[PDB]
Amino acid sequence: FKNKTVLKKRCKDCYLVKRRGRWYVYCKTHPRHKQRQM
Amino acid sequence: AAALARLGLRPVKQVRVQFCPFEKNVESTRTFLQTVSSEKVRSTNLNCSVIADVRHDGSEPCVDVLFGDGHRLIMRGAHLTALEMLTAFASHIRAR
Amino acid sequence: VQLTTYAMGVNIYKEGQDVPLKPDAEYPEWLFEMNLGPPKTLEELDPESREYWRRLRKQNIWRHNRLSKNKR
Amino acid sequence: GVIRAIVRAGLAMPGPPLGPVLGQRGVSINQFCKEFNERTKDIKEGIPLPTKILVKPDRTFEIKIGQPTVSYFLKAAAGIEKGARQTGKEVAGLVTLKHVYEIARIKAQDEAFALQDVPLSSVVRSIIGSARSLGIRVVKDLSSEELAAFQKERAIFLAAQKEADLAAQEEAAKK
Amino acid sequence: VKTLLPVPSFEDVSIPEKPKLRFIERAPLVPKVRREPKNLSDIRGPSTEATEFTEGNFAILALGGGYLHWGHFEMMRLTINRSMDPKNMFAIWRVPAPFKPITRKSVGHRMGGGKGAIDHYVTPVKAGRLVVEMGGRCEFEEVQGFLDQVAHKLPFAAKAVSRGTLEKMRKDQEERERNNQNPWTFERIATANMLGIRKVLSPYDLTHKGKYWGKFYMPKRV
Amino acid sequence: FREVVETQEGKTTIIEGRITATPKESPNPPNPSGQCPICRWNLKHKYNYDDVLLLSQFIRPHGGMLPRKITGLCQEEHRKIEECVKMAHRAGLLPNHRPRLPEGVVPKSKPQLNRYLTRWAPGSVKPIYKKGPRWNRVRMPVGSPLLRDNVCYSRTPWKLYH
Amino acid sequence: IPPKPAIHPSCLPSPPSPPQEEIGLIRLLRREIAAVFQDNRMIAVCQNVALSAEDKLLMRHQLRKHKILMKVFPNQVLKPFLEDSKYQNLLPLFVGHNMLLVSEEPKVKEMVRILRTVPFLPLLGGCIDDTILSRQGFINYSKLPSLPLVQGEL
Amino acid sequence: EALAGAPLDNAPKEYPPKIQQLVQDIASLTLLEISDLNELLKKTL
RNA sequence: CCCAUAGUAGGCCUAAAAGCAGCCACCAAUUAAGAAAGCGUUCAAGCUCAACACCCACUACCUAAAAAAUCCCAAACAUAUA
Ligand SMILES: [Mg+2]
Ligand SMILES: [Zn+2]
Ligand SMILES: [Zn+2]
């Protein structure tokens, strides 16, 4: 995960989720697009 | 209806549908037959086939399916929708 | 070195005698009713034809393509 | 599934493009090339034509021979060997309606047109659009007119090719 | 089925020569031998000139005051030249070349000895002044996109608006300013001097109507 | 309403689809000109989170909810019911609206801590250790931001941050 | 301070939306539907199979070999034409994906024998000279003898 | 004017009344009208 | 929420760039799809989107939060009437 204030989708398989108080960007095709809200 | 294609359709043997054209409660079985006779779900296996039976005085939208384990599953879509029977068939073919 | 270079030495008559060319009388008349240079716009076709709607659809596709260039 | 490939008839050596893909697919390549050569030996001109192949899960390929491309026929009917980089400001040649009509009526027997209710108007419009997108130009039916057109176009195209080669040499020299 | 609206045809907007932006130099052709003070009244308040459009239909509307040096102009012109279409878009500069001198002394020096030497040059920009104007035969999405991309990089607040957007924003602004519920307007209190408020206010607030403060601009003050 | 019935008899699963009965609305609405079920009964900004009868008519027996195309609420009224129903399952209200599970309710970990006006999830928020100085103190949220337009009788706004 | 209305706009009954003006696409669709319904006497509505375009062009070529055509229309433009004309008993047969057949002159034997090769091409039925029939109706009508002998047996 | 109720043939219970009327009209004679019918049928075909 | 055939390897230095290296025109067939609107490609394959066929909820109040050294600081109440 990478700390990012402005979250966005880097491809197509990225789906946004709301967990443990932070918005996370999970992706199964490209795992490099994992972002973490700070 | 890509879940049925991603899951699998090899152990199934023969499936068929029966309904009436003039009835107003045959759209569910119609779209079920349309989704089950697509391209991926049909090309994922060549050891199975489908039968499209259309009758006039049937007055019942029954769909009977069975796989290679000698079992039998018949689901009449008189009041059920398409997604319900789709996920039911998916669970029944995944669990066995 | 391989290349498909079969340019026949055609001068002024080798393009009609080498192949069985048919005169203008045997060819139908409706084969010359096609377009020539410039294509067809939108104000030259009546709104009761498929060509006008196809051209409008192509213009809409071009507009959508020109618009969707920065968004993801 | 299917693999799209456009190779030459009498020149089908095992390797370029049609090599790594055929190796990773699981089918042979030398046998395929030999079969394509023995099927294309009937052509006395070596015209490059597309090839549609199909592979079954038991590793067995089939060859379906169709009709050649349109750019080769257009270049053979016009007389020029290479296309121009511009259209309108630098015309490559002229082709009458008779030549494109013959090309269309010969090509309208492949696996793409014979399996569809397509008339002659559609195919002649398609070939006219292809000729316009290539770099040439169509015209009614000009006998003596196209004769004089060729007479002047030979000279003007020779001059255009000479000046284009000079410009390319200058650009190659400025390096 | 759905309807198919006709696409907006672009036939009355011809692209002139040199569609790209010109080069902006640092110091002008002649240096100023007389050191000028840092007059702060050149960026406080609304803008007077370079407000409406001229040729294009899209421009960046400024919402604050600030200075732009050579690096900012270079960044803007490079971004414009690298994010545009030379055959369909063209932009024209709206702000002049930087000419205001700024004197800077040596690092680690005592207070005194007169003013320092002139280093760089900046330009005054007020609120509501169009920074750059760009037109062409394009639509509104892409131009607004790559204009807000640069406006977010600017020091002061700036947005990418056009003609219809500016008209609509002015219309809603005047609608909100003419339909106020509470009958206590800042202008009525500042001009008529109510409750002795003129002691802590400023004489420039009579024309600003409480919409400006130093260099910022609050569009929600009404 | 409609339910699914699956029966096993001779290795032949019989999945039926019987439609049962369901009640309807009263044939005497106070405001028939309203476009929403809440507005037709003059309940605009007149309900709270303690009303277990109003919230039980737009949810599912297993804890789920119902969309806007089925109920009839608009955009701002559907979000208020979605927020008030979350404040009931945490305060011990609606005991019969628990989710189904095989056999997971075996180890009773944390005891039944009584709570009310719960806006956020318990096991998710972080404990405030600094609490800020004095002027910019970080207060604890309470209530709901969409329940501010309700009718009040205390001559003071609803203090949601204290 | 924004103006606070006494009645919220989402609570009061909204005015009706202005009806849009009909475009020429639907007009041409209805015109060609009426045209193909007046001249042709044999139609057969069948459920469109979501198959690949290869098999689609294959079956198109197999059908058009017997000098028949094929043309479909969307339900949005077809339901008014079916509810305002005489074909009011065919509206429940166009509730989803389907394919309409336009074949001139009665040739039900060859088309049935060429469509029964695939067991995934059903059909809801159709009318045979103002006589609505079903699939079993078609398969028992295709077994009728030749036209001249039936005309001359009386 | 719409169409008929679209019956089927697997359960013969109903028949069009026009056919019955025509049969009742043509099946109530001796042989002269049969000869006239044959004559008017062979006049064309 | 679904959905994608073809005239072709449209025109050209580089070996070829076959829909993303550059030029003016960016054609054309059945219902309907761009000589290419977003990733992976020396030259080909893999994925979506716009366009039919199909139903058709809001299809989006635009962006505006941060962590230093003795230990964080009064406590509490959204619901009896300004
Ligand atoms: Mg492709
Ligand atoms: Zn990703
Ligand atoms: Zn309401």
Side-chain angles (χ1 to χ4, degrees), chain D residues 59-83:
Chain D
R59 293 181 175 89
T60 297
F61 55 91
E62 289 75 15
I63 287 85
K64 298 181 299 299
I65 299 299
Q67 293 293 338
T69 180
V70 194
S71 179
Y72 178 84
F73 292 157
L74 263 52
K75 292 181 180 180
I80 194 172
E81 63 281 352
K82 300 299 297 300

Short mmCIF file of all heavy atoms in Angstrom, two decimals, chain D residues 59-83:
data_model
loop_
_atom_site.label_atom_id
_atom_site.label_comp_id
_atom_site.label_asym_id
_atom_site.label_seq_id
_atom_site.Cartn_x
_atom_site.Cartn_y
_atom_site.Cartn_z
N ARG D 59 -4.12 -30.76 -31.12
CA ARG D 59 -2.96 -30.33 -31.89
C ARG D 59 -3.05 -30.77 -33.35
O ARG D 59 -2.38 -31.72 -33.76
CB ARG D 59 -1.67 -30.85 -31.26
CG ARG D 59 -1.35 -30.24 -29.91
CD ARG D 59 -0.05 -30.79 -29.34
NE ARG D 59 0.34 -30.11 -28.10
CZ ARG D 59 -0.05 -30.50 -26.89
NH1 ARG D 59 -0.83 -31.56 -26.75
NH2 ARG D 59 0.35 -29.82 -25.82
N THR D 60 -3.88 -30.08 -34.13
CA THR D 60 -4.00 -30.34 -35.56
C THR D 60 -4.49 -29.07 -36.24
O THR D 60 -5.56 -28.56 -35.89
CB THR D 60 -4.96 -31.50 -35.84
OG1 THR D 60 -4.45 -32.70 -35.25
CG2 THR D 60 -5.14 -31.71 -37.34
N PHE D 61 -3.72 -28.57 -37.20
CA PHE D 61 -4.02 -27.32 -37.87
C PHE D 61 -4.61 -27.58 -39.26
O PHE D 61 -4.31 -28.58 -39.91
CB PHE D 61 -2.76 -26.46 -38.00
CG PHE D 61 -1.61 -27.15 -38.67
CD1 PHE D 61 -1.43 -27.07 -40.04
CD2 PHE D 61 -0.69 -27.88 -37.92
CE1 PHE D 61 -0.37 -27.71 -40.66
CE2 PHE D 61 0.37 -28.52 -38.53
CZ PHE D 61 0.53 -28.44 -39.90
N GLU D 62 -5.46 -26.65 -39.69
CA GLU D 62 -6.08 -26.70 -41.01
C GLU D 62 -5.81 -25.40 -41.74
O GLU D 62 -5.59 -24.35 -41.12
CB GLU D 62 -7.59 -26.95 -40.93
CG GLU D 62 -7.98 -28.36 -40.50
CD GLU D 62 -7.77 -28.61 -39.01
OE1 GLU D 62 -7.61 -27.62 -38.26
OE2 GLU D 62 -7.78 -29.79 -38.60
N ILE D 63 -5.82 -25.47 -43.07
CA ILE D 63 -5.53 -24.32 -43.93
C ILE D 63 -6.73 -24.08 -44.84
O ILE D 63 -7.19 -25.01 -45.51
CB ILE D 63 -4.25 -24.54 -44.76
CG1 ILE D 63 -3.00 -24.44 -43.88
CG2 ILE D 63 -4.17 -23.54 -45.90
CD1 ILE D 63 -2.62 -25.73 -43.18
N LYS D 64 -7.22 -22.85 -44.85
CA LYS D 64 -8.33 -22.43 -45.71
C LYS D 64 -7.83 -21.33 -46.63
O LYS D 64 -7.49 -20.23 -46.16
CB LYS D 64 -9.52 -21.97 -44.88
CG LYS D 64 -10.11 -23.04 -43.97
CD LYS D 64 -11.31 -22.52 -43.20
CE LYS D 64 -10.94 -21.35 -42.31
NZ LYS D 64 -9.91 -21.74 -41.30
N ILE D 65 -7.79 -21.61 -47.92
CA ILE D 65 -7.28 -20.66 -48.90
C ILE D 65 -8.40 -19.72 -49.31
O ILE D 65 -9.51 -20.15 -49.63
CB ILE D 65 -6.69 -21.39 -50.12
CG1 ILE D 65 -5.53 -22.29 -49.69
CG2 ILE D 65 -6.23 -20.40 -51.18
CD1 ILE D 65 -4.38 -21.54 -49.07
N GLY D 66 -8.11 -18.42 -49.31
CA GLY D 66 -9.08 -17.42 -49.71
C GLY D 66 -8.60 -16.54 -50.85
O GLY D 66 -7.80 -16.98 -51.68
N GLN D 67 -9.08 -15.29 -50.89
CA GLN D 67 -8.69 -14.35 -51.93
C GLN D 67 -7.60 -13.41 -51.42
O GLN D 67 -7.54 -13.11 -50.23
CB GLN D 67 -9.89 -13.53 -52.41
CG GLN D 67 -10.94 -14.35 -53.15
CD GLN D 67 -10.45 -14.88 -54.48
OE1 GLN D 67 -9.49 -14.35 -55.06
NE2 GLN D 67 -11.10 -15.93 -54.97
N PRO D 68 -6.72 -12.93 -52.31
CA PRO D 68 -5.65 -12.03 -51.88
C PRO D 68 -6.15 -10.68 -51.40
O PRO D 68 -7.36 -10.44 -51.32
CB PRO D 68 -4.78 -11.88 -53.14
CG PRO D 68 -5.11 -13.08 -53.97
CD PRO D 68 -6.56 -13.35 -53.71
N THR D 69 -5.22 -9.79 -51.08
CA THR D 69 -5.56 -8.47 -50.54
C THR D 69 -6.03 -7.56 -51.68
O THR D 69 -6.13 -7.96 -52.84
CB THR D 69 -4.37 -7.89 -49.79
OG1 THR D 69 -4.71 -6.60 -49.27
CG2 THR D 69 -3.17 -7.75 -50.72
N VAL D 70 -6.32 -6.30 -51.33
CA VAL D 70 -6.77 -5.32 -52.31
C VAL D 70 -5.66 -4.34 -52.70
O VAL D 70 -5.65 -3.86 -53.84
CB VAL D 70 -8.00 -4.55 -51.78
CG1 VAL D 70 -8.68 -3.77 -52.90
CG2 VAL D 70 -8.99 -5.50 -51.12
N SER D 71 -4.71 -4.06 -51.80
CA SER D 71 -3.64 -3.12 -52.13
C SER D 71 -2.76 -3.65 -53.25
O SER D 71 -2.33 -2.89 -54.12
CB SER D 71 -2.81 -2.83 -50.88
OG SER D 71 -1.75 -1.94 -51.16
N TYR D 72 -2.49 -4.96 -53.25
CA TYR D 72 -1.69 -5.55 -54.32
C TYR D 72 -2.40 -5.43 -55.66
O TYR D 72 -1.77 -5.07 -56.67
CB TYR D 72 -1.38 -7.01 -54.00
CG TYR D 72 -0.59 -7.72 -55.08
CD1 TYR D 72 0.80 -7.63 -55.13
CD2 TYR D 72 -1.23 -8.48 -56.05
CE1 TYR D 72 1.52 -8.27 -56.12
CE2 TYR D 72 -0.52 -9.13 -57.04
CZ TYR D 72 0.86 -9.02 -57.07
OH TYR D 72 1.57 -9.67 -58.06
N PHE D 73 -3.70 -5.72 -55.70
CA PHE D 73 -4.45 -5.59 -56.94
C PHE D 73 -4.50 -4.15 -57.42
O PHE D 73 -4.39 -3.87 -58.62
CB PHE D 73 -5.86 -6.15 -56.77
CG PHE D 73 -5.90 -7.64 -56.57
CD1 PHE D 73 -6.99 -8.24 -55.95
CD2 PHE D 73 -4.87 -8.44 -57.02
CE1 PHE D 73 -7.03 -9.61 -55.77
CE2 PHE D 73 -4.91 -9.81 -56.84
CZ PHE D 73 -5.99 -10.40 -56.22
N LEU D 74 -4.66 -3.20 -56.49
CA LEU D 74 -4.69 -1.79 -56.86
C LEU D 74 -3.35 -1.33 -57.41
O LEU D 74 -3.29 -0.59 -58.40
CB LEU D 74 -5.11 -0.94 -55.67
CG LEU D 74 -6.59 -0.55 -55.59
CD1 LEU D 74 -7.49 -1.77 -55.72
CD2 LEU D 74 -6.89 0.19 -54.30
N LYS D 75 -2.25 -1.77 -56.79
CA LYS D 75 -0.92 -1.40 -57.28
C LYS D 75 -0.62 -2.06 -58.62
O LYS D 75 0.09 -1.48 -59.45
CB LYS D 75 0.15 -1.77 -56.26
CG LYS D 75 0.09 -0.95 -54.98
CD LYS D 75 1.19 -1.36 -54.02
CE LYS D 75 1.15 -0.54 -52.74
NZ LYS D 75 2.23 -0.92 -51.79
N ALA D 76 -1.15 -3.26 -58.86
CA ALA D 76 -0.94 -3.92 -60.14
C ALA D 76 -1.77 -3.27 -61.24
O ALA D 76 -1.33 -3.19 -62.39
CB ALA D 76 -1.27 -5.41 -60.04
N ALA D 77 -2.98 -2.80 -60.91
CA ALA D 77 -3.82 -2.14 -61.91
C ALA D 77 -3.34 -0.73 -62.21
O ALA D 77 -3.45 -0.27 -63.35
CB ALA D 77 -5.27 -2.12 -61.43
N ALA D 78 -2.82 -0.02 -61.21
CA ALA D 78 -2.32 1.34 -61.43
C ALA D 78 -0.98 1.33 -62.15
O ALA D 78 -0.75 2.14 -63.06
CB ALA D 78 -2.22 2.09 -60.11
N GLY D 79 -0.08 0.44 -61.75
CA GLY D 79 1.24 0.33 -62.35
C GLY D 79 2.38 0.77 -61.46
O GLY D 79 3.54 0.53 -61.81
N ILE D 80 2.09 1.39 -60.32
CA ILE D 80 3.12 1.84 -59.39
C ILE D 80 3.40 0.73 -58.39
O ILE D 80 2.53 -0.08 -58.06
CB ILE D 80 2.70 3.15 -58.70
CG1 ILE D 80 3.90 3.81 -58.01
CG2 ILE D 80 1.57 2.91 -57.71
CD1 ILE D 80 3.60 5.20 -57.48
N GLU D 81 4.65 0.68 -57.91
CA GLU D 81 5.08 -0.38 -57.00
C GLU D 81 4.99 0.01 -55.53
O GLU D 81 4.82 -0.87 -54.68
CB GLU D 81 6.52 -0.80 -57.32
CG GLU D 81 7.57 0.29 -57.15
CD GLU D 81 7.61 1.26 -58.32
OE1 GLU D 81 6.93 1.01 -59.33
OE2 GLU D 81 8.32 2.28 -58.21
N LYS D 82 5.11 1.30 -55.21
CA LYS D 82 5.06 1.77 -53.83
C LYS D 82 4.05 2.90 -53.70
O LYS D 82 3.86 3.68 -54.63
CB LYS D 82 6.44 2.24 -53.35
CG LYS D 82 7.52 1.17 -53.39
CD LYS D 82 7.18 0.00 -52.49
CE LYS D 82 7.09 0.42 -51.03
NZ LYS D 82 8.38 0.98 -50.54
N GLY D 83 3.41 2.97 -52.54
CA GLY D 83 2.43 4.00 -52.30
C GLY D 83 3.06 5.33 -51.90
O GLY D 83 4.20 5.40 -51.45
#
